[PDB]
């Protein structure tokens, strides 16, 4: 029982640490707002900085788009090969039945 309460305390430590790390994972985008925080500090004409941030975001989004497209192609390739194996197994199994 003593070891078990100790293990429960250790599990609580792990839980809190993991929850904190997850929370920062969620706030991942917020760290990108460092530009937004710096931009907001302009307190004056700041449309050019907005446009620069928008261009950077466009570049990032295009990179992510290409990454997603190529990954989708790879996943589709894997899916066709899996389906081909499925059909081949069906045919071989049916022949084994018949033989």
């Amino acid at each position: 029982q003593q070891d078990y309460e100790t293990a429960k305390h250790s599990q609580h430590q792990a839980k809190q640490q993991a929850f904190a790390l997850v929370e920062i994972v969620q706030r991942r985008v917020h760290f990108s707002y460092s530009d937004s925080a710096g931009m907001l500090s302009e307190n004056a004409d700041l449309n050019d900085k907005l446009r620069q941030r928008l261009e950077h975001a466009e570049s990032d989004r295009s990179r992510a788009r290409e990454q997603l497209r190529q990954q989708q192609a790879q996943y589709s390739q894997f899916n066709q090969v899996l389906a081909s194996l499925k059909s081949s197994y069906e045919t071989k199994q049916d022949m084994l039945k018949e033989l």
Partner: protein, 148 residues
Amino acid sequence: QEKIDRYQVDLEELSYRLEEQTDVVEEAGELQAEYEARTEATEQEVDELKSQLADYQQALDVQQTRAIQYQQALQALERARELCRLPDLSVDNAEEWLETFQAKEQQATEALLALEQKLSVADAAHNQFEQAYQLVKNIVGETSRSEA
């Protein structure tokens, strides 16, 4: 001889199915390309409209004069007023509400972690139960958990 004839007929039917599905896939790919072009046209139009609105309003919104800035504070205060059940919520007394709601939030997180611990142990116990079930099924086949 008869067996090979049957398989040849099977192959003929499979070839017909392959032709049909190839035609269907070609039509689907043509439609997919058409919809890609249509979509890209829609984002092009949306971006053009956004840029043109930006250009038109360039002069309008530059001279904000930090005077229409405070309505944002008004909307934030009101949004908290409905979100936080505190119609008397004032920017003066909103700090006591801030600290009290932060205390509630941290208490909720602690209770959430407490529930999470027991949830994880229970789910893993069910996982071992399931593993026993799969081992039994593979060894013997279908059977209920009670018989396990």
